[PDB]
Design a binder for this molecule. Structure first.
Ligand SMILES: COc1cc(N(C)C[C@@H]2CCC3=C(C2)C(N)=N[C@@H](N)N3)cc(OC)c1OC
Length: 186
């Protein structure tokens, strides 16, 4: 099976990218939380599937692509074939999810993680079913050119706690941040 999850790190001004990189300086424990959250599977035989748009894929340094221990799928209407290193290419969220039934991606996937960018996140939030949003709130403003959509607070609900998610405010390089989990089911 699995579940459908979105993971994102956002500045106060809802920024997630700037010219191909993150808006903020490197936050090592944020990177570690991202890697752990998306990689961990305790089902023998499966791996998580990570879904990302073209901009996100290329924002990841070549030394870190494909994301080890995970099935990498790029979502794009403009690419003609899977970028080098990616396992699959799909033209829409719908098709990607459809892909996780057919013979190859069915017996193999545990969780599904949507890791960016803006358009995929949009696609996903407006997708039927039970979605969880894993949100890293970076408590500072940063100049950005890519953003995360606002979260209807009325619609999604904030989970006071979730297993493997720290409750306390973190700090690195003088930047404070906290982890939050939201959920919906429509
Ligand atoms: C600039 O260097 C790097 C950039 C990236 N990007 C852009 C993907 C980002 C990383 C952090 C993050 C992402 C995806 C997310 N969707 N949700 C949260 N919470 N956090 C990934 C890297 O390694 C995996 C990397 O190498 C260290």
């Amino acid at each position: 099976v699995g579940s459908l999850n979105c993971i994102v790190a956002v500045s106060q001004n809802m920024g997630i990218g700037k010219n191909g990189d993150l808006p903020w300086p490197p936050l090592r424990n944020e990177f570690r939380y991202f890697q752990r959250m998306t990689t961990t599977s305790s089902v023998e035989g499966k791996q998580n599937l990570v879904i990302m748009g073209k901009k996100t894929w290329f924002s990841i340094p070549e030394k870190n692509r494909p994301l080890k221990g995970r099935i990498n799928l790029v979502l794009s209407r403009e690419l003609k074939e899977p970028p080098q290193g990616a396992h699959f290419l799909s033209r829409s969220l719908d098709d990607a999810l459809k892909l996780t039934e057919q013979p190859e991606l069915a017996n193999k996937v545990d969780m599904v993680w949507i890791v960016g960018g803006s358009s995929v996140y949009k696609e996903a939030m407006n997708h039927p079913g039970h979605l969880k949003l894993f949100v890293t709130r970076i408590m500072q403003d940063f100049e950005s050119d890519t953003f995360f959509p606002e979260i209807d607070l009325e619609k999604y609900k904030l989970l006071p706690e979730y297993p493997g998610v720290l409750s306390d405010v973190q700090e690195e390089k003088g930047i404070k941040y906290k982890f939050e989990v939201y959920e919906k089911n429509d």
